[model samples]
Target: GGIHATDLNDKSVQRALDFAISEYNKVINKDEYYSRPLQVMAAYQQIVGGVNYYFNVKFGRTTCTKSQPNLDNCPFNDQPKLKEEEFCSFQINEVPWEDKISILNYKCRKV
Candidate 1:
């Protein structure tokens, strides 16, 4: 196993996952329904002068909408028709030495 096979339980992985999802939400989920990570299918990391994070995650829309300010309290939509899922793959570059974080690439589709 390589560095990309780093433990998913690692805090760094959690950090990267978070950064990945938040950025994903910004560009992709600009709508009434809010979405968050429902599950992480895969997580990878590589070190090449900087940190590269790759993640595959399932996202689900919540009952909370743009009108709702609190995200943590929001519940998943129970209605089958309203329940939607998205699977996203992302690469994020984290240059902690330079104190910068950037998204390298992302591909997402409805699942």
Candidate 2:
């Protein structure tokens, strides 16, 4: 007997979701209001024998300013701008005959 695509378990899925969240949190600065992460949503797509997960992370309003000699004194430096969104996509492979489940790769993008 073989595990069908629909037979994939929730526990495995949740673990992979957690992995995605943890990775996203790494670059955030919790103490800074603009750099804080607001929310994360995950969606999964079924692969041939596994799943590919997409994570959308929303961060508070912020702006990227050019650094200069007077940048420190610049009023707009690190100023709060508008909310931003980031995306992460990763693939998880699970073979019925294989004992291990693996996350193939992940890439993060800013939107």
Candidate 3:
């Protein structure tokens, strides 16, 4: 699958934001998970990339609080936000999310 063009009018980038929020809620509400709500949310914000996939498949863990996938993680840690051209080997593009809040240039290479 690929990233679909999001409508920048009413929903805007909120579609993705909503998805993120929903995922967080799912993780938080479960009985066998974390209790620190803010911390969990903050962790989610930090690993804005594919932290979920990274933690699950590679580290055998969940939540960024356990393992942050930033510059500290090596190949997966390369800050795509700062060095989109060099770091991002996938499809990198910056689209207008909301009126003024542009998130990052994302690159997705199909395997």
lDDT of 2 by residue, 38-96 (tens): 45555566657655554455544333232222221223224344444555555555553
Candidate 3 per-residue lDDT over residues 1-111, each given as its tens digit: 333333324253333443333343243233232111111111112133332111110111122332233322233223433222111111122234332332233332211
Q: After superposition, how far is residue 26 of candidate 1 from its true place, in Å?
A: 1.6
The model with the greatest lDDT is: 1
Candidate 1 lDDT by residue in tens digits, 1-94: 2444555687777777777767766677765787888888555555776788777889888887745667845788888778788899888778
Alpha carbon lDDT of each predicted model: 0.75, 0.46, 0.26
Kindly report which residue stretches of model 2 are placed more than 4 angstroms away from their true locations once superposed.
Answer: 1-9, 27-80, 93-102
Q: Please give the TM-score that candidate 1 achieves against the real structure.
A: 0.82
TM-score of each: 0.82, 0.38, 0.20
- Candidate 2 local Cα displacement, residue 93, angstroms: 4.8
Residue 9 shift from truth in candidate 1, angstroms: 3.3
- Alpha carbon lDDT at 93, candidate 1: 79
Top-TM-score structure, candidate number:
1
Please tell me which model should have the higher lDDT, number 1 or number 3: 1
